[PDB]
């Protein structure tokens, strides 16, 4: 029933603002926590409970923590418009940043702050009766997101055990870049993330820029646009818990259908009706058209091309006015296509979900209003190309110890670089071995 969201660092808090804006507007909670009464229907509904809890006076407060080492962004949230919505304890802020150093977050600075976060998460989990997982938002390019996210996931994994952890992670884009030390932090993050995450969702800002230029008509996008798209994706995936539908999908069903082996948990994501308001009324948007759309690489939110690999599992969420017969006809047509290929050991490649609530329209938003949408998360060997390019850039800098003295001064053994690089090499070989077909006899 309930789910708790954990937002870490700058990207994770800014994406959190868009997510909670959306969840408020979709359920109907006012920015000050109130919710207007309905006169057409006699009593209210439980749907908020997945994301909100009510006080005895009927105010709503959200099931989230915001974690950062610098104050400024959280203080911006504290002084903004949604000031009264959040509980002040939930917005946790340190004094000074991890300065793009994974070592500073993990060893030196995060060790002091981590116990307050764990006490808040414990206090949340005590006020639940059917908690069914953690959702985590962070970027692996920066120091505190990587280091404190890893340390906190380790502690959560010891204390709570089997409870599920689903991550949305912003990785360094393949040619757009913002800081020099991104490869070291992303490698060291990915090493911890391998052991302590159940599904990892991959995002690249360059893909969302491409998507907003090509489909929408925006020449000069900014992070609020990308964050609104991400919020729509998360709302589509979590709608199956919150609204009536023909075929519901619990968060444990994702893990059962998408992950074949415990290390093979990194998935690609795409979203179909990204369209502007002026284009939307000239065209029909049938089920088969959006199903055909989700498989084109122009629709993806990660910069990888799936034609260079094999699919292992797909999970398709339809929301809005869709009929199961059209979903079956579309999936059978997709299955007929020759440029879509599955590994031969996974014959029954698809999971479907169908929910009746169409996507909500946000007053300042740039998406059109549409009656139906589909969202896909899929596991494919093509993802191996992202790690190989990060690993090559790491090898280029580390061959000369380009920045290592910072990491060694802030508390890390030089050996940890070599260990992590060998673990990523083993992950690359895992994706090589799992993707090899034995379809030929003898």
């Amino acid at each position: 029933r309930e789910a708790i969201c954990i937002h870490i660092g700058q990207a994770g808090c800014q994406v959190g603002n868009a997510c909670w804006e959306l969840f408020c507007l979709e359920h109907g909670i006012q920015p000050d926590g109130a919710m207007p009464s309905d006169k057409t229907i006699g009593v209210e509904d439980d749907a908020f409970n997945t994301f909100f809890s009510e006080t005895g006076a009927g105010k709503h407060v959200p099931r989230a923590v915001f974690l950062d080492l610098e104050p400024t962004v959280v203080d911006e949230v504290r002084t903004g418009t949604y000031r009264q919505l959040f509980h002040p304890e939930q917005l946790i802020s340190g004094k000074e940043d991890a300065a793009n150093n994974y070592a500073r977050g993990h060893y030196t600075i995060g060790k002091e702050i981590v116990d307050l976060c764990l006490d808040r998460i414990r206090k949340l989990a005590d006020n639940c009766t059917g908690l069914q997982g953690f959702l985590v938002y962070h970027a692996v390019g920066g120091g505190t997101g990587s280091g404190l996210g890893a340390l906190l996931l380790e502690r959560l994994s010891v204390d709570y055990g089997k409870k599920s952890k689903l991550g949305y992670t912003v990785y360094p884009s393949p040619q757009v870049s913002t800081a020099v030390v991104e490869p070291y932090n992303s490698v060291l993050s990915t090493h911890s993330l391998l052991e302590h995450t159940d599904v990892a969702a991959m995002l690249d800002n360059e893909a969302i820029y491409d998507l907003t230029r090509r489909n929408l008509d925006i020449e000069r996008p900014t992070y609020t646009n990308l964050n609104r798209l991400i919020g729509q994706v998360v709302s589509s995936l979590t709608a199956s818990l919150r609204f009536d539908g023909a075929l519901n999908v619990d968060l444990t069903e994702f893990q059962t259908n998408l992950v074949p082996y415990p290390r093979i948990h990194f998935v690609l994501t795409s979203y179909a009706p990204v369209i502007s308001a002026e284009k939307a009324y000239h065209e029909q948007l049938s089920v088969s058209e959006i199903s055909n759309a989700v498989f084109e690489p122009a629709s993806m939110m990660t910069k990888c091309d799936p034609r260079h690999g094999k699919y292992m599992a797909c999970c398709l969420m339809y929301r809005g006015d869709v009929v199961p017969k059209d979903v079956n006809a579309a999936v059978a047509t997709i299955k007929t296509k020759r440029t879509i290929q599955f590994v031969d050991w996974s014959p029954t490649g698809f999971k479907c979900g169908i929910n009746y609530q169409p996507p909500t329209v946000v007053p300042g938003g740039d998406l059109a209003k549409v009656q139906r949408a589909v969202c896909m998360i899929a596991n494919s060997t093509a993802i191996a190309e992202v790690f190989a390019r990060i690993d090559h850039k790491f090898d280029l800098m580390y061959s000369k110890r380009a920045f290592v003295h910072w990491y060694v001064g802030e508390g890390m053994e030089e050996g940890e670089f070599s260990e992590a690089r060998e673990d990523l090499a083993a992950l690359e070989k895992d994706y090589e071995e799992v993707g090899a077909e034995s379809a030929d006899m003898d």
Binding site: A246, N248, T252, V259, P260, N328, D344, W345, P347, T348
Partner: protein, 430 residues
């Protein structure tokens, strides 16, 4: 002669809601539960499916079990939902996750005792108990695992009664779930030992019924569940109304099952025709028989033309002559003689009941035991071996606690079932 119903999982609860609507309508039970019928013939066998609560009212002898209450809240919210006894809804706090091992071993044993307590109270309340009837899907999670668990417990406690199942099985063309082969294989392994007679339905066949026969532009699961509720309520009709040639579940079983493993059957229901055409053709026994044998009207994907009939049964409802029924069954056996296994001199049983379903002059339900059912199991076994050689997704099942030996046993048992069907298909007198 009382039937006890068990409803398991989402599909089972959804089909059950429409079934109990159809049965309550046929016996003139108001959705408030009050008897409002207009002839004693309706009242005199109401006990078969209903128990009598005080001052008129009737309550239905059914147990509803599920791991998340969403479906049960939908059925309680439905138009006939009030009729169901509140104490009969049993639920847990977390879903099956599409995993057979969770449903059978971990979340199963916590509830199963409370389910057995309710089933025992219902069985021991009857003055004479007839078989149990269970509807569930094999591809799901709680349906497969908890259904087969409960079936095993009831077979331990009541081994002399009949066990009958209606079961939904994955379509050959599109999967709804990735891990379908494991759940299907383990469930068929459990059923072939425990069950006495099992009926199988493919959703793809119901879609083809709707599109080709009824020409519906946009069918929905409500239509599929009405077709299923119609045939299920039809098989039992001779238990609860008078007729010229009465029949019973045990009498169907004795005439249908030649050997105890050969208990998997095909289903059909004859009067299907679109609303525009229906004004143009009256009902008659030749028309029903012609529709009855057309593979278009059969509710499973395997087609009879690739196999042979071991046995079949037809139950007719309505006031009609016995001569036309007998001569139709003779004519079909004589004209198509190559499709009937030759070492049995007569393969068809007939039965006749006076009271048709409301708004039809006559109706028939068809049950068929045909060797072409082997093709579905062969397909499931191939996909299972493809998945199993690479041990795909196996850690979920092993982490719940299953021994790998169960998978090899279940595979071996299905392979022997396919072999047994193939050998009797090609048997000869010599």
């Amino acid at each position: 002669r009382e039937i006890v119903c068990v409803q398991a999982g989402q599909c089972g609860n959804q089909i059950g809601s429409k079934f109990w609507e159809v049965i309550s309508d046929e016996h003139g039970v108001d959705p408030t539960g009050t008897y409002q019928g207009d002839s004693d013939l309706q009242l005199e066998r109401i006990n078969v499916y209903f128990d009598e609560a005080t001052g008129g009212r009737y309550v239905p002898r059914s147990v509803l079990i599920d791991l998340e209450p969403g479906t049960m809240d939908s059925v309680r919210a439905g138009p006939y939902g009030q009729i169901f006894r509140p104490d009969n809804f049993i639920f847990g706090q977390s879903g099956a996750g599409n995993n057979w091992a969770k449903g059978h071993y971990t979340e199963g044993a916590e509830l199963i005792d409370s389910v057995l307590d309710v089933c025992c109270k219902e069985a021991e309340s009857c003055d004479c108990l007839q078989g149990f009837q269970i509807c569930h899907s094999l591809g799901g999670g709680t349906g497969s695992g908890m259904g087969t668990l409960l079936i095993s417990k009831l077979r331990e406690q009541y081994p002399d009664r009949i066990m009958m199942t209606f079961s939904i099985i994955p379509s050959p063309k599109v999967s709804d779930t990735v891990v379908e082969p494991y759940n299907t294989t383990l469930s068929v392994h459990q059923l072939v030992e425990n069950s006495d007679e099992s009926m199988c339905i493919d959703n793809e066949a119901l879609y083809d019924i709707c599109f080709r026969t009824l020409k519906l532009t946009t069918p929905t699961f409500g239509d599929l569940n009405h077709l299923v509720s119609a045939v299920v309520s039809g098989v039992t009709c001779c238990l609860r109304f008078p007729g010229q040639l009465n029949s019973d579940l045990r009498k169907l079983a004795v005439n249908l099952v030649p050997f105890p493993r050969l208990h998997f059957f095909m289903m059909g229901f004859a009067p299907l025709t679109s609303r525009g055409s229906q004004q143009y053709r009256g009902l008659s026994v030749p028309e029903l028989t012609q529709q009855m044998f057309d593979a278009k009207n059969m509710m499973q994907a395997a087609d009879p033309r690739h196999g042979r009939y071991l046995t079949a049964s037809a139950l007719f409802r309505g006031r009609m002559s016995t001569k036309e029924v007998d001569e139709q069954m003779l004519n079909v056996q004589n004209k198509n003689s190559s499709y009937f296994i030759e070492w049995i001199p007569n393969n068809i049983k007939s039965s006749v009941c006076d009271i048709p379903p409301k708004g039809l002059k006559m109706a028939v339900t068809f049950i068929g035991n045909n060797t072409c059912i082997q093709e579905m199991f062969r397909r499931v076994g191939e996909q299972f071996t493809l998945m199993f050689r690479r041990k795909a997704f196996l850690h979920w099942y092993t982490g719940e606690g299953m021994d790998e030996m169960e998978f090899t046993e279940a595979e071996s048992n299905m392979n022997d079932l396919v072999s047994e069907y193939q050998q009797y298909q090609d048997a000869t007198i010599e």
